[PDB]
Amino acid sequence: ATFEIVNRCSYTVWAAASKGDAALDAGGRQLNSGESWTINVEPGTNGGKIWARTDCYFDDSGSGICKTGDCGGLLRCKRFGRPPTTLAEFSLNQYGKDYIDISNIKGFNVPMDFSPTTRGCRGVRCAADIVGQCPAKLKAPGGGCNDACTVFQTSEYCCTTGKCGPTEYSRFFKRLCPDAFSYVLDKPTTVTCPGSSNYRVTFCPTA
């Protein structure tokens, strides 16, 4: 499958793509404002994620730091990033179908649209000003709006027992972005697409 990753933000982001134990394609790249990066993701990939990182500094060896979404200090991510990260999530060619969603379960840093570029399903978007409206206790100094599990580490926020409900914090994310997951047991906002669809992930789709 082809993913085109587009930075429509007015600021530079460092895109990342991983399935948790390996990079997808090159795993990461700098995207200046307006730049597009096309990657190829192998059919059958389960549990892939794409996200943006902000305020990064990398040396010549591809080693450094980012203020949101850092993946162990690497430009080319092999593992998932540090919250807060708005997440594009996908599993491809699962019994004939692709499944895509946007998630705020690990917080929010950059607004995002995640849409197919082929026929057969709709896209999803979270483009509200979650950072500007972020509750005081969830604000991340480096930028972004943390999820409550990251901040407070309780069974209820992290849904550790497999029994949890919505919370004041999850309802904040859900109010602003109804089409994204706001906590682990949220009513699913997953979209089912034809197997082997292609996609575009756009950072700052409105701005």
Side-chain angles (χ1 to χ4, degrees):
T2 297
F3 286 70
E4 187 179 54
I5 303 169
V6 181
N7 182 20
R8 188 173 294 153
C9 307
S10 61
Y11 47 89
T12 300
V13 301
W14 287 258
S18 175
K19 62 179 195 72
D21 62 346
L24 299 177
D25 199 287
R29 215 201 86 172
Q30 183 173 325
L31 292 177
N32 296 324
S33 176
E35 289 188 329
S36 303
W37 179 34
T38 300
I39 65 170
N40 291 283
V41 175
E42 189 182 33
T45 292
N46 178 80
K49 304 189 195 300
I50 287 162
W51 67 103
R53 300 169 285 173
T54 59
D55 290 309
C56 304
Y57 297 85
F58 293 110
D59 63 25
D60 37 281
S61 71
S63 168
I65 186 73
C66 302
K67 290 194 182 178
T68 65
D70 188 70
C71 62
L74 300 177
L75 170 63
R76 287 164 279 277
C77 295
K78 296 181 185 182
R79 70 196 214 200
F80 293 140
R82 188 170 193 268
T85 53
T86 320
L87 295 168
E89 307 183 308
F90 47 93
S91 293
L92 309 179
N93 311 97
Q94 304 295 302
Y95 303 102
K97 297 294 183 183
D98 291 356
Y99 296 94
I100 68 169
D101 67 80
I102 290 175
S103 175
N104 287 321
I105 290 170
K106 297 289 185 184
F108 176 103
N109 62 339
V110 176
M112 178 187 282
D113 180 278
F114 186 9
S115 291
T117 56
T118 49
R119 260 171 84 156
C121 52
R122 66 173 186 89
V124 285
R125 178 178 295 190
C126 177
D129 188 12
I130 285 178
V131 178
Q133 301 294 1
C134 188
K137 291 181 188 178
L138 299 183
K139 293 175 152 294
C145 188
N146 286 311
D147 65 285
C149 171
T150 295
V151 175
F152 294 105
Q153 297 279 272
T154 68
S155 295
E156 191 65 14
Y157 296 137
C158 302
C159 211
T160 304
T161 70
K163 299 303 189 308
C164 58
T167 66
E168 277 312 282
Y169 296 124
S170 72
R171 287 180 184 98
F172 160 77
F173 288 95
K174 196 64 165 184
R175 168 168 66 86
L176 294 179
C177 283
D179 287 336
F181 281 89
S182 65
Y183 72 109
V184 170
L185 290 184
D186 207 352
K187 183 165 79 65
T189 48
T190 310
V191 173
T192 307
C193 292
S196 297
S197 296
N198 298 314
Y199 303 91
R200 181 178 287 117
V201 176
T202 307
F203 305 120
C204 302
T206 62

